Nucleic acid binder design. Structure first.
Ligand SMILES: Nc1ncnc2c1ncn2[C@H]1C[C@H](O)[C@@H](COP(=O)(O)NP(=O)(O)OP(=O)(O)O)O1
Ligand SMILES: [Mg+2]
Ligand SMILES: [Mg+2]
Length: 430
DNA sequence: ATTGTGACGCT
DNA sequence: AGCGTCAC
């Protein structure tokens, strides 16, 4: 009772841009705005691969990983924007620079952890304490939360979406104990006010819309964020967790979407997150290891301790290209030319990074895939990165991988290569 | 013939 | 260090 921790010590938000690469292209080209449209990589094979889809186009069934020719079968009027190509490969610079725009705005409000090109976690605990003392016990108006959903509400004793949203918000606000600056539900609510302000600033200053989750930890904030995408934010309280988890498939929780989550389902004979509460911590550790078992025991109760790391910049800078089917690289000149292409893009990005961010990479990772291997990477080897020079970097990468050529004659490369990858890592201040 | 990223865990 | 998992 009194000594049972409840995981209500922090306020954590997760901000995720809505159809991000699409919004970047729609900002640039107004003809694409408010249309079914998608962003595509390459074009020659089946029209190119779709990597981002506007919500208008999703209504027709268009998804990421679809070929554009097939997407056009579902949506004949689909508009397409193409990823830029440079040195023979897709170049994501426009989206990385748009991401920096958003992350720099978010960093004005709190320390952020860059989780991907379009999402960041925010630790709002301190900002919430400050705003609470500035308030001085004043109630929180629903006008301060114009895009917020309270998960699980309304409940108890209108048929339009916005009406239900406001009904649930009213129920939440009416029950709130504003006199108590240590109430976790009040703390979440103030967190949600701040996240409204943050999202308004992102939209005002970039044109981009986003969704957000506000809860007590990263896993619940991420789950909350997706509950009412797009252009809305969702508060998941500690009290909402039993009902939310009671019908939540295990695979929806971050880190359980793969083999471990399938083994939880298989070994325990359960389907939903909340069913995990019936096992002891030792039982879960016996099946899934000490770390995973303790994590699952706490997470199915809504408790998680993973901190929002103070890290706004990526810690690796990488460049990779697949060479599928008959395009696999089969000569030494081919392998050299593409390592050079990858190394030149890497040198551009690394020089810009050193100027912007006062750091230098010190290790170069070289990874390849051979034809016939079903694994993503087939070989990874490291070497020293001492100079931001594309020819040196590509020569060094070749020296580290040259022994995997099974061919007798040097001029040929066998078995052919289906992926090349260069990654700069191990940054030091400069 | 998804592709091009990126973080972290295990041994 | 090199390999594997998981997520964008
Ligand atoms: N598998 C992949 N391969 C390449 N690029 C990808 C990718 N997945 C995502 N991207 C790129 C394209 C995406 O625009 C961007 C952000 O990924 P999301 O947040 O998962 N998807 P979005 O923001 O589009 O829609 P939503 O409103 O559901 O958040 O990363
Ligand atoms: Mg997104
Ligand atoms: Mg995202």
């Amino acid at each position: 009772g009194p000594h049972m921790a409840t995981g209500q010590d922090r306020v954590v938000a997760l901000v995720d841009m809505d159809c991000f690469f699409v919004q970047v292209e729609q900002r640039q080209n107004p003809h694409l705005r408010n249309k079914p449209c998608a962003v595509v990589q390459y074009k020659s094979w089946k029209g190119g691969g779709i990597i981002a889809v506007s919500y208008e186009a999703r209504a027709f069934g268009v998804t990421r990983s679809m070929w554009a020719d097939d997407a056009k079968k579902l949506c004949p009027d689909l508009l397409l924007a193409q990823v830029r190509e440079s040195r023979g490969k897709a170049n994501l610079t426009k989206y990385r620079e748009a991401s920096v725009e958003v992350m720099e705005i978010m960093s004005r409000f709190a320390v952020i952890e860059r989780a991907s090109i379009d999402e960041a976690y925010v630790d709002l605990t301190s900002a919430v304490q400050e705003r609470l003392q500035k308030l001085q016990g004043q109630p929180i108006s629903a006008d301060l939360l114009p895009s917020t959903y309270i998960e699980g509400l309304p409940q108890g004793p209108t048929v339009q979406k916005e009406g239900m949203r406001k009904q649930g918000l009213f129920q939440w606000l009416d029950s709130l104990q504003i006199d108590n600056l240590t109430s976790p539900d009040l703390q979440l609510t103030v967190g949600a006010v701040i996240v409204e302000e943050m999202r308004a600033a992102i939209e005002r200053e970039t044109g981009f819309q986003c969704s957000a989750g506000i809860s007590h930890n990263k896993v619940l904030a991420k789950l909350a964020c997706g509950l009412n995408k797009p252009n809305r934010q969702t508060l998941v309280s500690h009290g909402s967790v039993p009902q939310l988890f009671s019908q939540m498939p295990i695979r929806k929780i971050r880190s359980l979407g793969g083999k471990l989550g399938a083994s939880v389902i298989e070994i325990l004979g359960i389907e939903y997150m909340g069913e995990l509460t019936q096992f002891t911590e030792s039982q879960l550790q016996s099946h899934f290891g000490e770390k995973n078992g303790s994590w699952l025991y706490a997470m199915c109760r809504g408790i998680e301790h993973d901190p929002v790391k103070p890290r706004q910049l990526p810690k690796t800078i990488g460049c990779s290209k697949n060479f599928p089917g008959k395009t696999a690289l089969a000569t030494r000149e081919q392998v050299q030319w593409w390592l050079l292409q990858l190394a030149q893009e890497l040198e551009e990005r690394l020089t810009k990074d050193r100027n912007d961010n006062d750091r230098v990479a010190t290790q170069l990772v070289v990874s390849i895939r051979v034809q016939g291997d079903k694994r993503l990477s087939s070989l990874r080897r490291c070497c020293a990165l001492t100079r931001y020079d594309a020819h040196k970097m590509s020569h060094d990468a070749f020296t580290v991988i040259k022994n995997c050529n099974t061919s007798g004659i040097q001029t040929e490369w066998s078995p052919p290569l289906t992926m090349l990858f260069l990654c700069a890592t191990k940054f030091s201040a400069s």
